[PDB]
RNA sequence: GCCCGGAUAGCUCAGUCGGUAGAGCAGGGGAUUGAAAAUCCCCGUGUCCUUGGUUCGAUUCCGAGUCCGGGCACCA
RNA sequence: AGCCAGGAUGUUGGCUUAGAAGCAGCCAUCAUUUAAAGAAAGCGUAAUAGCUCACUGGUCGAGUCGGCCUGCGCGGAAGAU
């Protein structure tokens, strides 16, 4: 049997997970970043033989589940995976946003649902609430869905008895073509890649050349065998059953995941169908903290990728960071995270910074270039025509929280080019500039909305703006590594802020400082620095006052000096905060 | 009739019966089949002058149907187009932009004697010049 | 509250009152208006 | 924060009681050369800092703002 | 003063804004139905809808109201043995 736990973050969903193990939180979760936080975050398929209560020794293809929005695609996978969906939910905190979520993925994927109660032993549970609480939401059934505990429990059924009888037998005939599926591959040295897999056709012995589809290429079978809770070797994967599939693989790209696999004994046309595609919602660029670093840092994606295919990246560049990567994460847990499991891995330090977007641009000439970078823009006289790319966007939320929606994405810069329908559900539809929206606009949705809406971008079409450069000067000395692009309304703003950062971490100079953002000669914004003065007539007393202006005549007329041969160093600061990095774990 | 399970009085379009960022979306976007309405109000489109905006409160029932019911075409629109002005004042009302004929005005109570519960027609008309003084140009009335 | 020294009303809603000697408006309305001292 | 003077082409700048704005330079062309500099010549390519108002009419006048220079006060 | 009612039509006033529907802003603010109702005094809406006051009816049966000039008071009003 297969299935696929289901359910929102932090339901016992994994708690659950070992108790069924154990009738056959805690384990499961391998990496320290599990066991703190405490959320899980890779899913780690099982296996058990299950006695079912009428004598049949039924075989549970067990698999846990991560529940967050970072994790979606994680969670899109495994479900192909199996045929099944147990789905979690407590007695008390009533029906997710991604409980919800979670199962209009299920439902174009047609999968069979076993709705239950957990942590049915809480004072403040409802259970006789709870099960209406579905019908008119989730659409599914739950009028008697199996209740139980969790904490033990109860101990009801446990439910693998309703289970088996609401689990279809896995569909696929041994002795034709072999059509294993990938699954989370996920890369080792000594062993080169590892495939977990779901073989669907045919079985898989031992020293057997399987042979990948799409990459055309061909291996020998030099280990396999079904994951326990701990690892177990087998002479052969039975079809219908999950492993994983050890061979010579070295290569960095030899098998991506979603790709067919078959046996080279006998080639298939064929399927399977293929995952899946998937796009960025948070979508921040990352740096190496040092250039030197580079090297082995562009191969750590190299090597982490495949370990996590939710993740999209591609090679860009800095005024001041050299070359690093614009990264497409899911959400903000999946950037906060990979920002642990390199460097609290590889010991690869790391520095975030807002996103880099490209710009369209045609001279005063008639010919396009595109500006991925502040700096390298044409001179003012040169530019004839700036154009901010687009971005696409596909909300799908519930009609109560449309009025706090639709607000944002006005303030955003938006064209409200549908709005209709699907029942309830409204469906809008908007254009909006990809530079207002990779900045955590998906957090925004996430939290007016309370937690129902979705999205999906693209790169669209290019527009023009009345955008501008908005240099950094200090003391005059202008400078190229602060430049910005933005849109003439917002200038003011990201103008007479810009400046405050520099106000707080540039240090007390000899003589007082100007910094001031502006456009072209034309200056927007301004704050200073304080001199630093010697007292000077902490000394005469007196009372004669010409004989005391004497004194604070030469601390003016020589600070008129000292200002004009000036100069600035700025070590680091053209970085930090400056470069958003101004926070932990930074 | 009269009284409505949930009406929804809107202006819209003479010359369309299922756009969206007009309406669609605008019936309190709650159980309309477009794809009715657009057979139905462009049914009654080809009587009436074609592009203009027409008042049309609609009438929702729970058992989905419904009667919308047209009625027509507003007071305010009908000077502007013997204005010949493709907007309003443009300038501030206090001064001048628009033109009419005192015989104009005159049929335009006629034209909407239904929603004009004015006794006198002619006492009628002078609601109109409200339509034409908002638009604050000199009627020659 | 507001302390200041002269209290006056603001919405519509607002009462003042003369508790003890001091005086307070009150504004069931808007919390914000409340006022004592004046 | 006050006082005085300012904000005019890509850059440095001249001008305005209320009457359709310019200069050097940069840029783009012409002449010259076998073509190259150089040199002479020719084109302004601006919504007169931004935003509202009065006037037939505003770069001037008025309101609000963001700014530049100098002079006081603050500025171990 | 309280309690029961009505609080409408031209019509989304004109523009300007993606939206401007009594109500984001600018100019205007007449006309009809009448017991009476501002192109609107607040709340309200993404935008409408929605809820009130203004003005009128009903019960109600005895004074009610807002300023002026003056007497005296109250807040404003924190210091070091
Ligand atoms: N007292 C009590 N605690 C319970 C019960 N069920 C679950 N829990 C606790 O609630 C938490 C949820 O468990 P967990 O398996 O992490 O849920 P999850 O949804 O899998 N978490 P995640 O989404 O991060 O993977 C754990 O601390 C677990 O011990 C219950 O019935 N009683
Ligand atoms: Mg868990």
Redesign the pocket.
Known sequence: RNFSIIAHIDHGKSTLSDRIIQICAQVLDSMDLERERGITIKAQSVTLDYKASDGETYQLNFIDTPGHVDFSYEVSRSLAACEGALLVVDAGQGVEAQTLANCYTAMEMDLEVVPVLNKIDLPAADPERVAEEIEDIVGIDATDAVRCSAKTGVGVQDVLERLVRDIPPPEGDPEGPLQALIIDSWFDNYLGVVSLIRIKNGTLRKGDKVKVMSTGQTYNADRLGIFTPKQVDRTELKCGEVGWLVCAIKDIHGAPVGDTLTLARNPAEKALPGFKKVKPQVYAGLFPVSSDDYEAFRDALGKLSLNDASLFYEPESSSALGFGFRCGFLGLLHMEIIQERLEREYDLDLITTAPTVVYEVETTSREVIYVDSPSKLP???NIYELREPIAECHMLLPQAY???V??LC?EKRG??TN?VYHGNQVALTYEIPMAEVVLDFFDRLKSTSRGYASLDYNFKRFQASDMVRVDVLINGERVDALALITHRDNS?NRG?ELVEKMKDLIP?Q?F?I?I?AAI???????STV??????VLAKCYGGDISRKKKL?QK??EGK?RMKQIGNVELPQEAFLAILHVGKDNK | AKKVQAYV???VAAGMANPS?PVG??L??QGVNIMEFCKAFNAKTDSIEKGL?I?VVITVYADRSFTFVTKTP????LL?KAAGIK????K????KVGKISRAQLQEIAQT?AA?????DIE??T??????A????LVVED | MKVR??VKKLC?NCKIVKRD???RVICSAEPKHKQR??
């Open positions: 001179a003012v006289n449309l009025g706090n639709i607000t006005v064209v409200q709005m003011q007479r007390r000899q007082d100007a001031q072209g000669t034309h200056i927007i914004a301004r304080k001199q630093l003065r010697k007292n604070l601390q003016k008129k | 009085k809107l202006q960022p979306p605008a309190g976007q905006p008042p507003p007071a305010a629109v502007k907007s309003g004042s443009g501030p009302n206090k001064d909407k929603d004009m519960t004015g006794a006492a009628m002078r609601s109109i010049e409200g339509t003084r908002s638009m604050g | 020294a002269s519509r000697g001091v005086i001292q004046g």
